[PDB]
Every structure is written in structure tokens, then in C-alpha cells.
Amino acid sequence: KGIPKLDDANDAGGKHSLECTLILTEGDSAKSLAVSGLGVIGRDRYGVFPLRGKILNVREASHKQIMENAEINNIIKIVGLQYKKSYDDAESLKTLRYGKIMIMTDQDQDGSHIKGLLINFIHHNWPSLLKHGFLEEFITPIVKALSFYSIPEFDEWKKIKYYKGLGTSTAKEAKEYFADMERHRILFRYAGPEDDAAITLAFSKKKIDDRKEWLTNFMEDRRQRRLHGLPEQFLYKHLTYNDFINKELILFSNSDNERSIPSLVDGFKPGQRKVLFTCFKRNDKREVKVAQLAGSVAEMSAYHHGEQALMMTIVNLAQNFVGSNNINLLQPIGQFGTRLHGGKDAASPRYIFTMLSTLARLLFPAVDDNLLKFLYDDNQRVEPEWYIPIIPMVLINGAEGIGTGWACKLPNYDAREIVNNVRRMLDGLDPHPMLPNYKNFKGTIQELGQNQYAVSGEIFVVDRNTVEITELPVRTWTQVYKEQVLEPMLNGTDKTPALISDYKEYHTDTTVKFVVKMTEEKLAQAEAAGLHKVFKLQTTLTCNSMVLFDHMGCLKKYETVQDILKEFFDLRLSYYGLRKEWLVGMLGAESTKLNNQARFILEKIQGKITIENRSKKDLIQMLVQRGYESDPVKAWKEAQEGPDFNYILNMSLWSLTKEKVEELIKQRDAKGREVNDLKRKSPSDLWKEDLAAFVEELDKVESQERED
Amino acid sequence: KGIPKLDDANDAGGKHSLECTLILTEGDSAKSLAVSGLGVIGRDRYGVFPLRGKILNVREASHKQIMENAEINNIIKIVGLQYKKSYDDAESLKTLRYGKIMIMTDQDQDGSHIKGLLINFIHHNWPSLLKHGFLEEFITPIVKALSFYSIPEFDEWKKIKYYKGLGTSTAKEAKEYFADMERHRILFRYAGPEDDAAITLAFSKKKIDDRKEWLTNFMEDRRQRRLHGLPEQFLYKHLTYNDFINKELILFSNSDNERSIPSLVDGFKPGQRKVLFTCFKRNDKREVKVAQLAGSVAEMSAYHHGEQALMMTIVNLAQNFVGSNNINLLQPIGQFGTRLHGGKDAASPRYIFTMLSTLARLLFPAVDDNLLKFLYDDNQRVEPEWYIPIIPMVLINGAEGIGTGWACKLPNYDAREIVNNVRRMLDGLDPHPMLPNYKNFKGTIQELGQNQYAVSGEIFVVDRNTVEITELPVRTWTQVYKEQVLEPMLNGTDKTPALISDYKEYHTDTTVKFVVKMTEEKLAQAEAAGLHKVFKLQTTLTCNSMVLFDHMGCLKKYETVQDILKEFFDLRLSYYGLRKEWLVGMLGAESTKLNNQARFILEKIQGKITIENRSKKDLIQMLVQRGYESDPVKAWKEAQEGPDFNYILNMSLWSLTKEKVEELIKQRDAKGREVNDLKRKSPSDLWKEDLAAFVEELDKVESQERED
DNA sequence: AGCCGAGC
DNA sequence: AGCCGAGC
Ligand SMILES: [Mn+2]
Ligand SMILES: [Mn+2]
Ligand SMILES: [Mn+2]
Ligand SMILES: [Mn+2]
């Protein structure tokens, strides 16, 4: 047939074609899973063809894009479809190589999306097929204990095995699935107008605001359901297209927003935050390959997605070039990106290395980990719902992402101006308004109207024939500007003639210098109409969508950055008081420990008590009878949810020495003074300390950056 | 010109061609190193072209092989050479695009080989060029401290930086090398007949026995030089072809034998032994990717070669299929190899995993590490010169390799027969002769003549038209036998008609079953001439080259396997006595430690001495005045090349408890009995224990293998 | 029409 | 002519 990736059914194309079924699979591993599952006998009436991933959404797309899509035309050639052809009469059905399409995808949310996009593909082009049951699906187990399909179905029921993707199952597992197809085959049925309303709702861009009300109801419904304790509704026989969209594909759309939309608190996404927790737990003193780090992230943080997406998430975190990250939390050791190509020049993740920027732990203090809520995957603690930075990192690095029904876009903001605003709010003032600021950007950003800005590069007049461009607007890439601006100016086009005579390129990897030559008359005309407008050095910047998950996990739209700063400030200052309440408990339990350690050793050295020959049961009963507290640190640590004196009795015999008692009393007096000192500090004083240490290293790091 | 990998000189092909120089580089990284080193000005008269690696040796090669070699014809097209063309007259030189070839390679031994193979290439085809200085080389530093070329030159002279390959140097380092070319350019000069004698000596297969006397002199010369303390002679102006071959290329040939030829002791090569030391130090409880393990091997063991060769060395160690490893020291978790294709079906090293076979530490006991000599790379201890297995592993896994002037080939041998022979020699008997035995090989191996054997598969007569092949001779691969034997029998050839009517394939991944159909008359003729001869199921096995490095590091040829077994036995039994001498010292120092720990604690509990308030200087002076020994373990450990009582004074205060003194006296009496017990054992008794434990796990592992 | 990025 | 493997 000409498609190498396809294994065609033996009866496909013959007189039995209508009884044949084409199996569309997610990944080539599922293809091999389905091929061995059918075996010799199944190879007759069942074809199997892979899909590379998420397919084209053909409801709204350009005609050229549809005709140029390799996958869409492969499915058309395999099944024998024809565009605009309605299938009713027996004469029309004779032109079909297959009678059914059975979609086989993973049981995660991304599989349901591919399911929906294939439903969206058939519903648009041939509704004659969709009404009559042309589409089926083959479900697999997500978990076993003896088979369970959806994770809510397994939790309500409660050797256990979790199935990640279709490639996890292999060998006799595939053959067992195809032995009984009554359980694993579910047919899509067309109920009526409710179905068409659901399909178009998901996959049409006219429905965006409807999808907002769609997911807003689901989020509030589940949250209220989670409050009242009602169980999570699950699926998995016939399945209507309406029920699939509303009870299944919605789970992908919500999960898409959760991963793609950052949190207001730390300005992170679940993927990124899992990366930083891993780096935080590894605490590497030397660089590690991005590929190896990605593998370690997946093991430690329970990251269930592909390795390619995770490595680019790491690379995205490490890019320091102009227009990307005002503060890069990962060091870019090796070549991560060029301002030239806008990060697309990144070297392969195997050949580049990274590690924590020294500012990472300063922005995310270690002690604040005790105040977080760490999540769990299959009894494995992984990473918190959020970290709590000393400043609103969501504003610094310009968090952005695209979900379903919502999108988030933020520009960057200067770290020092934010720290100053936090200091202003700590002294009781109102915060100053903030314009977007990009690190090492020599151009200008000025406010046009509400949430609209004008970003402009730099261009000068050297002489009558010459102009010099030393800057491009933020996110405008050197190479791109050369190809789509100066080269059309130099070579001219069909409609527009050549404006400029020549140009040269002086660029530095981190800088932009263009020297353009023009005629005297044409330069005068250029600066008459203005230089920035002619040479396209102004780009509008408007964010009217700022969408973040607040500290309650609820999706909220923020009209001004000052709202994000204020809401962050109340939470962060509240957690600073929690840190003082935690520290005085920890430092207090440590001081009691040093007191009881000192009291015991001072009585044994003075001869008040002799531990010699005392039995374990006798000594432990005597130690508690003499008034010694039991391990105040572990007692206070366990209280956050037989007596243990071991901390006293595991001390070295060196302790009784003259210098070991003297250094222990000094340790005892120093910790009590430490508790007294920190108890007299306000939570705002702790915040100012963290800010002062951050700016000290920020000045050191950024000055070392410029010198290099 | 049509070669994409080439950067041509601007003046190449013009009237200045004779002044141009073609730079042949080792690797594309050296290509980029040389391109940036020349810069804009150097791009005129200097071309640069990469070489993939070791090139063809054209002195003895087939005409088709020479004409089909892409690299050789690329250099010919680039330089403008013509075969058989002698270059003397000015009319002939006008046809050359370049006047010189400057070879740029790493300063390691492998670079010198590429240098020599290029010298061997020009010397053979165009001696008219070689006599007149057509060839030059560009040397780089191997180390700096301020520049040193050969490692013996740096050690005799003695921030230090070691340069591994040409890719280590970068940026201004490349430009510094090409600023001064008087130091870094050396011209090859033809002295006379000594040169031709040296070139042919290295690269001709008629000279093999001459290369043996060549390297035998060098090995004995350096060893005698190493004994008398004379310094190692080094190179690095003009260099004669004779001096290059004898004073440089010989260093590659000796290093080639050292890596490619196994040691008699552990049956390992430096590459393999570095792998096993790493796995031994990591002590992984779970599997690790072969790619990741290879990276860890390189870091820990200081492995300076490419990662691809190391991963296949790991895969070679893990293959359990028929005809490979009687005992695989690494587990083959994932798909390492098929008997079908003979290991060439191995999956990519990134997708497969391995770990230590449970028999690994049983064959290489951990305690014997204390008896080895560990080497050092730049102050980093890495791995011993050899391990010392309980049985001659060189015989079990059939060590083999190809060096320069020598080659080693050994078949496998049954582990149990070897253990029995060792047990026979331990009881004072003579060892039984041993035929090669391959694990799970159902065929027969019988002795023909001295060091010559007949390996035969299995074929039966089912009926008049049918024969059944259940086995193929060792190393004969299923797929290969199908293509080159049965298929020519079935389809016939031009000269030979079709012998067999049909065949079928019942194979199991670990087994071979062929059912062949023939005419009644043609089967009778087949078994008349014999079935094994007709169907090619007999392959001769002769090893007359068994070449191993003995425990002195000297190359020796062994005529019989019994010599290898005897020489191993004397060394291994000698080291078993060393283990007893080491154990009684360690167990003795441990018993003294438990005695002085008990004496101190028993006097403090009885009240004989009070440590309370005693100053550090006062107590330490008192402890030594009362007769307590100082850390017998660390004193005995340091003796193998202020007083420390810390082991006594770091004891927990729990020690003074009634059950902690009782368990300490029991520890004291148990260690003294342990010393008394092991002191009454003979070194042969320790060996028999290690053998008995090995066979117990070997029976368990191999039985679990068959059940799986 | 195309970028932005976490996903298949 | 080609395998075996530690190397480029
Ligand atoms: Mn999936
Ligand atoms: Mn960003
Ligand atoms: Mn090298
Ligand atoms: Mn082998």
C-alpha cells in the first residue's frame, strides 16, 4: 500500500472489507502490543496502524494544512475514505477498505485526547459514519490487584501493579486482552444533538468561552464533591459521544490546565517543580548531564511523562540569554541557548550539563520545606504542592503556558524592584506600580494602556548614509530579524522595492549590532516616518490573560500584577510567621536536649549518679524517675502529626572529659541565647534577612556574569 | 568538490597548489579544532579533512577493497593523486591540488597508528612523494604545567592539566597552537633503506614473526630499563620514518597487546577489569542502564577510551547465550543477544540494564582485594593489575583478543571440571586433561590432535524423506546457518544443484530445531557420505596460539591448557596463604581491640578508674600509663606500608549497661575463638570452602536458569 | 500565519 | 573472504 509503518489486514480491500477493523494505536510500542495480541488468526480481519501522537484538529484548520498532513492522508488511504463522501447506500460502502476504526490508546488523560481528536476527525468530515457506530475503542487496565481501569475505580474498591502507558503490558498480557474482547471493546454510539454539542464544544475555537464555563463547573463540582466526601465518578458496553466528552475528555482538559498553568505562589508548573525538588534533594556539588538529571528526576519525583519533554523543561529553566529568565535557577553549563535563534540552538541534552544556581536555595530557603505539604504517588512522597519563595518568582521569570479553555502569559519583572516593593509593604506602605523589565535589555518598555506596553529596541543615526541598530525588542531574535526584516529590505520584494543598500553584522552571542547603509534621500524619508516604525523595532506587549492557581488550587484571573504581588505577600508573610513558630519549637526542643544532656553528664562527672552495671530496664526506669525528659526533638517531631533516652546514652565517653564538658556547656548556653535572640525577632525581620542575603549574592553573581 | 565533510583550501587547485597543505585530522572535533585554529587567514593555503578512524592498510588488501574504500578515494580526489603515478617532473606535479599532507592526530598511541597507516598509505602507492617530504605532522600537548608532549617527558621533568584527545583543547588553545608552528610542525624525512624496512615491518603480514621479535626486544628492553632505573626514552624539527616506527608506533603496538591480550590470572583485559572493579565498588542492589554504567565506569576507573567500545565490552561480559560465556559475570537484564544472530541482535545500550551475577563476588572474593595491587591514574587509585579468582576464569569464558604481532584464542571449559581438577591438585594428585566444554551445548567436541578439536552438532534420521537437526556446532549461528547452508541446499546454486526439497523452523531463542525434507534417493546418498559432512555440522577447532600475560606482566605462549591451570594454581594457592596471613592479622587486631575495650569498660564498671572530669591530655597520658594499646586495627593497618584511644572513648554510654557489657564479653570471647578456629585451618581448607560455596550457588543459579 | 511550552 | 573484539 506504500505506508511502511502499517500492518494491513489480510481481508482488507476484499469482499469482506466491511467486517475488517483498523486499529489506531498511540505509539509504536502499542502497535507491537496489538500485533502480538492478535497473533496469526487476528492478522486476517484486523489492521493496525500507529499514530505519532496528538493528531491534527481538522474542524478549524487551513485547507493547505489538512492536505499537507501525512497522518490524515495515511488514514484516508488505509481506510479508503474520500472527502465530502457520505456513506449510506451499499454502492458507496463498496469503496471502503475497512468497516470500523478501533482506537487503542493509553488509559491516561492524553490517550483520551487522541480518542477525542479522532472522534473530532470523523465527526467533521463524515458524519454519515459517526452516527452508525463506525468508531470503537479498545480499553486497557491502568492498574491490577483483579483488573481495574480508571484510578478512581481502584481507589473506591480499596500484589498491585500500576500500568504506565500501553508499552508496560507485554507478552501474555497482550494476548490475554485480545482473548476476551467483550470487556475490552466499547462502541461509540450517537445519541443525538447532545453529542454534536459536546464534540464541537471541546474541539472548536468558537467555544473557548463555553469551555471556560465548562471547566469552571467541573472544578467547582469536584471541589464541592471533595468537600462533602462524595466519591469521584468514573467510567469503565456502549459509550455515547456526549458522555465521553463530559465524563472523560474533560479529565484531560483539567489535567492539561493543571500542568500547563503555573501557580501564583512559586510561579511553577508540576513538571518544573518536580525538577527543582529533585535538584534540591540531590544537592549536587558538581554539574550533571541534563539527560542523566532528567532520569533522576523521573525516579525521585514520580514524573510519568516522556523524557524529551522533561529535558526541555530543564533546558527552559537554565536559559540565561536576553528575553528568557531574569533569574535562571539552573546553571547553563554547556550550550543551552543563543539569543540569536531564541533558544532553538540548544545542544542535545546528553552533551550539556547543569546544576543549581547559588541563588536557588536563597530564593527557596531550606528551612521553609518544613512548612510545605509534600504530595504522594503510590506511597512515595515526592514534591510539595508549591514552594514558597521569598519573592514572587511568578513575576520574575514571566511564567506562561497554554491549557484548554485558558492561557497564561506574564512578562518578566526586575528582581530588585520587586524586593524593594516587598520591603515597602513590610514597612507599611503601598507598592509602587511595576513595568515589565527584562534583564540586560537595553531597549525601552513603556506603558500604553491598561495591561498594554510598547517594547522598543535601539537604533541611531551615525551619518547621512548610515544607521546603527544596537538593540532588538524583547523576544525578537537576531537571526529571525535578519531573515524577515533586513534581508527583505535589502533584496526587496514583489510589492515593496529595496529600502536599504547594504548591512553588516558585528553581533556578539549575547548582543546585537547592525550597521545599515541607505541612500541619503531614503534615510531622510525613513526618519521622517520614524526609524523604529520603518525598521520594525517596536512590538506591542499586552497581557490581558494572567491566569494562576492560587494557594487554594483554584484557577483565578488577575487583572493587575499588583494583585499578584499583594496576594503573594499575604501568603508569604503568613508563612514567615509559621517559620518562626516552627523554629522556636525546633530550637526550643534542641535547647532542652542540650540541657538534659548537660544535666546528666554533670551529675555523672560530679558523682551524683553512677551508670556502671545498671541494667537497661533498671537504668531507663531510674532515668525517668530522676526527671530527665525523653528525646525532646523526636517527641516534638512526632507530635506534629517506650521512653527514648538514647540521645543521652549514645554520647561518647569523651563527653566526660574536661574539654568536652566545657564545650558542651558552651553549646548549652549558646543555644539558649539563640532561642532568646530569634524569639525577639519579628517575622518581617526574618524576611528582611532573607532578602538582604539574596541581593548580596545576586549582586555578586550578576557582577561575575558581566565580567565573564 | 562533492565531499561535504571537507573544508577546501582557497588556493587549492590553483597555480599555488604546491604550496598548499591538506590537514588530515582524527575525528571531526579535531577538524573543528583545526578550522578555528587557522581562522580567516589560514583558510587560504590550508585545507582540512576529517578521518573517521583507523584507515585502510593498503599494503596487503584486495583490489576491490581498495577501490571500494570511501576515505582512500576521498583523499585521492582532494589531493589530486593518481594511482601508479610517480611524481618527479614539473609536468607531473601540475596535477596535484596540494603539495603536502599534514596529519593531525591525538598524542595517544592510537593517533600514532593513524599516522603510521597514512605513512603506510603513501609509501606503498607513491614512494616518489614520500622520499621528498610530502608528509608532515602537527603535534599537540598531552599535558601542561609550560607545555609537555609525551607523558615520559613530563614525568622526567617533574596548575597541571591533562589533555585527552584533540577535542579537549578549544578556543584560544587552538589559535595558540597555530600562532607558533615552528614547535608544532615536524616533517617526516626519508633517511634510506632503514625507513622502508621499518614501514613494511609494521604494516605487512609477511613480517608478523619479525614483529614478534620486534616487540619481544622492546618488552625485555623496557623491563630491564625499568629494573636498572634508567629513564624512559621519549620523542618530541625533523623525524625520520625509521625513528617514528621504532620509537613511536611501537608504543601503540605494545599498548595494543596490553589491552587486547588477557592476563592468565583473572582472564581479563584492562577494559573488562576496569568494568568489574567499578561494579564491585558500586555494589548495585538493582539494575542500571549499560549506558549509565559505562559513564560511571569511565569516571571511577579512569577509562580514557570511547564510550561505545566500553558499552560493548559490558554487553560482551553479560551474554549468556550458547557459545559465549559459561559464566556471565554480569546479568543480562534486557535483551543483550540472540544465539540466532550471535550477539549482533543486541539492543541499544541505553535500553538494556545489567548488574552483578551473584556468582561474581563468589568467584572474586571481597577479602582478596586486600591482597591485590591497585594502580593509580593521576593520583586516583582505580583498579588492580589483576584480580585473583578461585578458579582460572581465563579458561571458563574462553578469553580471546587480537593485538599486534600476537593473538590469543581460547575455547571455554566447564566450571565444575575445573573445580574438580583444582580439588584434585589440592589433594596432591595430577590434574585430568580437559576438552573444551561449552555450557548448554548438546553437540560433541572430541580431540583430533594436539590442540585440535572437532565440534559437531546433532542431526537425526526421522524417516526416509526427513532429517532433524537439533544442534549446530559451537559459534555457528542459527540465522547464518540458514542463509549460507540450508538455503543454498534448497534453492541450489550455479555449480551445485538443489540437494533438499524443503525445510521448516521450530527454533526457540535458546535452541535450534531444523526439519529438512529430501528425496529418498538423495537422503541415502547423504548419509552414505555422512550427514554431518553433507549438512556442514562439523567445524574444526584449533588453538595453537594461547598467549597470556603471566603474573609478572610478561607475554608468554602456553602450549597446553594444563600449563595455564598449573601456573594459575601455584599463584592462587600462594595468595590463599597470603589471605590467611592477612586474616589472622586483621582478626588478631580486632580481638586485641575487643580485649582493650572490655578491659577499660570492666574497670570503669568495677570502679577501678573514673573518667569523670579527667582532662584530654591528662586522660590520654593516664590511659597509656595504665597499659592500654592504641587502636590495634589502625596501627596494624598503617603498619602495612599521638596515640589514638578514640575507639575506646567513642563508645556509647550504653556500653556500661548490664546487657551491653554482657554482649561485649560475648563479642570478646567469640572473636578469640574465631582467631583460634581460622588459625587451625590450612590455606587449602580456605580454598575448598570458597569452591564449595561457589558450586552451591552455581547449582542454584543454573537450575533457576533452566526453570526460567 | 506563527510563536510560546508541556505534552503525545 | 570473513569472524572474533577492543580500539579509532
Ligand atoms: Mn500515556
Ligand atoms: Mn519564560
Ligand atoms: Mn585519542
Ligand atoms: Mn568470549
Explained architecture:
Chains A, B: Residues 20-137 form the Toprim domain. Chains A, B: Residues 536-545 are annotated as: Interaction with DNA. Chains A, B: One of its GO terms (molecular function) is metal ion binding. Chains A, B: The record marks 402 as: Important for DNA bending. The structure holds 2 chains of a larger assembly. The first copy, chain A, has 4 domains: 1-260, Rossmann fold (3-Layer(aba) Sandwich); 261-440 and 545-579 and 680-708, Topoisomerase II, domain 5, CATH 3.90.199.10; 441-544, Gyrase A, domain 2, CATH 3.30.1360.40; 580-679, Topoisomerase, domain 3. Chain A has 27 helices and 24 strands. In chain A, the strands form 8 sheets. A 6-stranded mixed β-sheet of chain A has the order 2-1-3-4-8-9, with helices on both faces. In chain A, a hairpin with a 2-residue loop joins strand 12 (374-377) and strand 13. In chain A, helix 22 (561-605) packs across helix 27 (683-707). The longest helix of chain A has 45 residues, at 561-605. The A-B interface holds A 292, 295, 604-607, 611-616, 618-619, 646, 648-661 and B 292, 295, 604-607, 611-616, 618-619, 646, 648-661. The complex binds manganese (II) ion (MN) (4 copies). Chain A binds 2 DNA strands through helix 5, helix 12, helix 13, helix 15 and strand 14.
Could you give the topology of this structure?
The structure holds 2 chains of a larger assembly.
Chain A: E1 21-26, H1 28-42, E2 46-51, H2 63-67, H3 70-79, H4 90-93, E3 100-104, H5 109-125, H6 127-130, E4 135-138, E5 143-144, E6 147-148, H7 151-157, E7 161-162, H8 172-179, H9 181-184, E8 185-189, H10 193-203, H11 208-228, E9 238-240, H12 241-260, H13 270-282, E10 288-289, H14 290-301, H15 307-318, E11 353-354, H16 360-363, E12 374-377, E13 380-384, H17 393-396, E14 401-402, E15 407-408, H18 415-426, E16 444-449, E17 452-456, E18 458-463, E19 466-471, H19 478-491, E20 502-505, E21 514-517, H20 520-529, H21 531-534, E22 538-542, E23 547-549, E24 555-557, H22 561-605, H23 616-625, H24 632-638, H25 646-649, H26 658-679, H27 683-707
Parallel strand pairs in A: 1-2, 1-3, 3-4, 8-9
Antiparallel strand pairs in A: 4-8, 5-6, 5-7, 10-11, 12-13, 14-15, 16-17, 17-22, 18-19, 19-21, 20-21, 23-24
Helix pairs in contact in A: 1-8, 5-10, 5-12, 10-12, 13-14, 14-15, 18-27, 22-24, 22-26, 22-27
Bound molecules: manganese (II) ion (MN) (4 copies).
Residues 324, 397-398 of chain A line the site of one manganese (II) ion.
Chain A binds two DNA strands through residues 26-27, 51-55, 62, 105-106, 110-111, 113-114, 256, 259-260, 269-272, 305-306, 308-310, 312-313, 316, 342, 400-402, 407, 409, 475.
